[PDB]
Design a protein around this ligand. Structure first.
Ligand SMILES: Cc1cc2nc3c(=O)[nH]c(=O)nc-3n(C[C@H](O)[C@H](O)[C@H](O)COP(=O)(O)OP(=O)(O)OC[C@H]3O[C@@H](n4cnc5c(N)ncnc54)[C@H](O)[C@@H]3OP(=O)(O)O)c2cc1C
Length: 358
């Protein structure tokens, strides 16, 4: 029993995808402590329209003002489960809504969406059904762990530069001014909790949101959110084409799911300065590849993801939070399934299971 991933199998009409609704949010502070509020949300504050163009030094502060979170601390779904546990009797959708839902991180859904086009990096997703609800939690592959531990200094600094860009673009208060003089502490995060549905599969998922734009005409989340990105400056049409084909696919997938309507990109030069800014509306990203023989097709992304959810739902018959069906995928093959009990794959914690059962 396996699931093929080739684009040609999934190029029919765009499937049903429910307009996402924000159910709530949560924040992680500088000590990685959870707070069920928006204290970590910051506010879009781009360079003033009359002043100079951007010239953001994305290396400033690296590494002495860098407090990276410990990537060896395993969190899986725990922060999302805390939100669900604390809102389980306040959830919209009527009686039994959660029981028919699939609960996961937005980023896990993104990797599903990009699978038909992914040539380099495989994935593993652990699945457990508990009180009807299907939980999906990513598992770091052996190869991914090796690459992480061997991360080159350049990529460590590049990751810093991505976080640093937000500090130049965002303020702590609406209408405030960015203050890049502080630390980059990657324990800090703001997460939106969203309800959607793909095909016949209701979804509850959380996703990190970079900022809210107080100048946006629509103030209702997620319509007011902006995602921030950096990417190399491009000079030739061929470079733009490669960017549309490969980078925009992942940017589109990531912001389409939570209904974030704009991605603002800072283009950085080889010396690590952002000297150009461009806004990419999410609903217009596909226009750059629509008549492109080597482009991507949002319908393929969503139809494959729907097929995976149907496959996972039919595969995971047993309701048991200690049982895991591990879905494994590598470029050039189908998604395959193996079954495991308890450690190390089981990921629903007793504090969640015991509260929900009582
Ligand atoms: C071994 C391991 C270490 C991880 N360490 C982190 C971490 O230190 N911080 C974190 O936020 N998530 C980390 N994750 C991923 C989390 O488990 C979880 O999937 C994610 O944080 C859920 O938030 P989403 O918004 O759904 O994640 P996504 O939509 O995938 O990405 C949103 C943002 O998360 C950051 N991020 C996502 N994945 C990673 C990663 N593998 N390593 C470092 N940063 C990442 C990054 O800022 C990214 O922005 P950008 O896309 O511009 O690069 C790690 C996963 C594994 C397997």
């Amino acid at each position: 029993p396996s699931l093929r991933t080739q684009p040609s199998l999934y190029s029919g009409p765009f499937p049903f995808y429910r307009r996402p609704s924000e159910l709530g949010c949560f924040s992680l502070d500088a000590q990685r402590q959870y707070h069920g509020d928006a204290r970590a949300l910051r506010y879009y504050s781009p360079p003033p329209i009359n002043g100079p163009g951007p010239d953001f030094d994305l290396r400033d502060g690296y590494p002495d003002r860098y407090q990276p979170r410990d990537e060896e601390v395993q969190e899986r779904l725990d922060h999302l489960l805390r939100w669900v546990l604390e809102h389980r009797n306040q959830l919209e959708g009527g009686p039994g809504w959660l029981a028919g839902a699939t609960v996961t991180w937005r980023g896990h859904l993104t990797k599903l969406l990009t699978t038909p086009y992914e040539r380099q990096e495989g994935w593993q997703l652990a699945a457990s059904r508990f009180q009807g609800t299907l939980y999906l939690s990513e598992v770091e592959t052996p190869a991914a762990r090796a690459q992480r531990l061997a991360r080159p200094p350049l990529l460590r600094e590049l990751m810093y530069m991505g976080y640093k860009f937000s500090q130049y673009m965002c303020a702590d208060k609406p209408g405030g001014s960015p203050d890049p003089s502080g630390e980059v502490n990657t324990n800090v995060a703001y997460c939106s909790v969203l309800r959607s549905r793909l095909g016949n599969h209701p979804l509850l998922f959380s996703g990190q949101v970079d900022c809210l734009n107080p100048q946006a005409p629509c103030t209702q989340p997620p319509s007011c959110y902006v995602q921030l990105k950096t990417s190399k400056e491009m000079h030739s049409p061929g470079q733009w084409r490669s960017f549309y084909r490969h980078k925009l696919l992942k940017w589109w997938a990531q912001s389409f799911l939570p209904g974030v309507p704009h991605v603002v990109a800072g283009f950085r030069n080889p010396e690590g300065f952002v000297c150009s800014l461009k806004t990419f509306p999410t609903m217009e990203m596909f226009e750059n590849v629509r008549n492109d023989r080597e482009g991507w097709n949002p319908s393929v992304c969503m139809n494959f993801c729907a097929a995976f959810l149907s496959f996972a739902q039919s595969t995971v018959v047993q309701d048991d939070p200690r049982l895991v069906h591990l879905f494994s995928w590598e470029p050039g093959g189908p998604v395959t399934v193996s079954v495991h009990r308890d450690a190390p794959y089981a990921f629903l914690p007793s504090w969640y299971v015991e509260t929900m059962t009582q």
